[PDB]
Symmetry: D2
Subunit: 250 residues, 4 copies
């Protein structure tokens, strides 16, 4: 019978495309979401119409807190409830906004959201995934620009760097269990909805390969590769999917 995947933040944009591609590949999927219930439920509806009871939704805040470990355990539990197994975890959900060092949300809340979503929740989901255990693997959505970071995005950038460390540490630790742990690192893919079109076009013009952003599907293609049998010896690797952007000097 069919393998099962959890994709965090799967209601929209890149997470949605990953969930859809995994589903087209034969996976049953847990569509995790936070606020986007309509989009999550609509996606599960689309996938279940394609193949009955091959998709479920699971809501959780992945901000760091006292209850985050239980929340992450329940996400993995929801995959076993629905499908009796959990083969693939994709850590995609991510808060992304500036946190300037020099002078809305308190800074402790910004820490909670940015470090929780990008690092701590992936760590806790990774714990719960492994504890509950074939071709088992984890794919972490990293960032090709982590060493050339956006100005005033220190907490975001810290969370993504921590995610590289988790990818490597978990690859090493989980290898004895046959669980591979890899990353996919977009440069610019779907640009933020709140970005103006002038600013979007400025980023596009920087990308060497085609002067355009990656589609969500091009990002998902790398995830599909990493979870496949064609990546059976790949662990601890982070594949940039950035059209050369990270190679361009200032």
């Amino acid at each position: 019978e069919a393998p099962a995947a959890v994709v965090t933040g799967a209601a929209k944009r890149i997470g949605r495309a990953i969930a859809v591609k995994l589903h087209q590949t034969g996976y049953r999927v847990v569509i995790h979401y936070h606020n986007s219930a309509e989009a999550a439920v609509s996606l599960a509806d689309e996938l279940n119409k394609e193949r009955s009871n091959t998709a479920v939704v699971c809501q959780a805040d992945l901000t760091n807190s006292n209850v985050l470990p239980a929340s992450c355990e329940e996400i993995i539990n929801s995959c076993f409830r629905a499908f009796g197994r959990c083969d693939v975890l994709v850590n995609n959900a991510s808060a992304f906004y500036p946190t300037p060092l020099v002078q809305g949300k308190t800074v402790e809340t910004q820490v909670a959201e940015l470090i929780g979503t990008n690092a701590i929740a992936p760590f806790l989901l990774t714990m719960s995934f492994a504890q509950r255990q074939s071709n088992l693997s984890i794919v972490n959505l990293c960032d090709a620009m982590v060493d050339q970071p956006c100005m005033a995005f220190s907490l975001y950038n810290m969370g993504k760097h921590a995610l590289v460390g988790l990818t490597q540490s978990a690859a090493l630790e989980l290898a004895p269990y046959g669980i591979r742990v890899n990353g996919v690192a977009p440069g610019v893919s779907l640009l933020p909805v709140a970005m103006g079109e002038e600013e979007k076009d400025k980023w596009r013009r920087k990308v060497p390969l085609g002067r355009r952003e990656a589609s969500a599907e091009q990002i998902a293609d790398a995830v599909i590769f990493l979870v496949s049998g064609s990546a059976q010896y790949i662990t601890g690797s982070i594949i940039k999917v950035d059209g050369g952007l990270s190679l361009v000097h200032a």
Copy 2:
């Protein structure tokens, strides 16, 4: 008048050596400590005997929490209270222990300690340092083995990777203010008290340059360079002080 430095976790081991060498160079120093009050007071005594009114202690827990931003603000305030200025911040304090992914602190506590000390506290101290602002700089104590991490040290490794990101992000953002941000990355220096002698000797035998761990003073020498007028164009750099250890394959 004499510049001033804050050193976190300065009561013992590497931080103590750092504080000592800063003081020998002419700095006034805030000796931050958490639990090691006797060692901290004793160090301030020794330094004030050498030059009166040039050392104070400052107690703070650097575990993550909603009041960590206030604690970090108060550490920087304590330097201004004692000395009227704060020229150098050294982020040295660090929790270090295993957190296995599979199999009596709660995981919430482990996250708070390891990510708070190694990453979030450095970030909040950097914010407070900058907000309060000559040769101004910050030095982060990193880890040369961050990409070849110890088995079952995921959270620690996550915090140290996050600290690399902070070093880079803050270097970029604080450059306009004339604040340099750099790192020093030991391999093995003073080995942990709790580590057994056999295990210490196994690590020693791995170091190409001398088959021995670094002294705390050797680590301090790199901090002294980075804060000095000889490093005036250096920002965002992490200097390994590892005797070649990170170059050795499995």
Copy 3:
């Protein structure tokens, strides 16, 4: 209308497995070789027996010299001669042996180790670009480039130079629609000269399975990078090392 690929050092081992997988995917192939003529011709025969007129051999020494640019140009020319096009270049051929700092002269060691691992890939890349669909180059790198084998300075310098080429060429050739990427094995097929005991020592260091990668596993990554599933990927080096590079001393 089938695309064509040049694979350097393709007569045996990993280059053979790459050539075979590319052929199985639908490519016509130039099997470049240096000394392994019998193995090269035998491979071309297997492939042509599957699909007529889809494989040719091409001999060349890739040691650095003043005629190396001509040799590299001729390898690319040989793909256009046989197939009328050249879509994919795989830089796989490589000399590998120690060159301690303290029979071959040092001049020869530089020529072979830097030639095969870095300069020939550069010249092949120049000739490939000059003669120009889903065009790409794949360089065979080394996951252990930053934790090098003792006394392999020149080999390691060549593999580091190859990373630089991968990045430099990705940048410069992107406007031509040519993608340039790498595949970095840790331990795969161990050297023929290596003793079984020494092999086992290396196998035991690999976190994922305590074994070396198959040639096919390496080839799989090459196939991904040349495919339409990697159309936005350029300047990326994919480790295929079972976690080996993550293991401390």
Copy 4:
């Protein structure tokens, strides 16, 4: 008696500042040069007028060829002939110009000059230095922008990458002899004489720390640090001296 250093390409610019600063620190120096004979001799005259018998000159082409190994042996031998010892080797000499992949010097000459000066000569000098052998070390002049390379500078970038490899491989291999091997990686320092003023200003404006290039002396300061007793545990490290330039995204 006084230790002795070889500095390649020491007649002008950064190499000259390095030789001067080593000499000021107390070293006797071999000034290697290729075409800049008048400047080389003028420097030797200046240094010797300062302290007698502390500077000599050695001419050689460092282009790759069948005779380069002998030329490199002779450079090292010049230090022994004059001073009876050779404590420090600085690999500074470097060809730097574009070599476009798609369409003066033939390409084989470009390869010889760019890979020879930046990689092969450093390797052969290192062999010669080690074979002839206290605080012994080698410092290689690297490039902070090696991973965000100048368009159409493939062979130069290849040579600098190879030099990183040499730095690491030689640090590992020479550690048992007590020879440290490290690098210094400028971003922009003294800009090329042939670069137009407008283009120079364009580079300066990209540097976060001060919006200007590094003086040669600032580069030399990091060299002095690495050769000093304050760097006794440091080997295989490359210190960026780039004002944050390499952290700046496109």
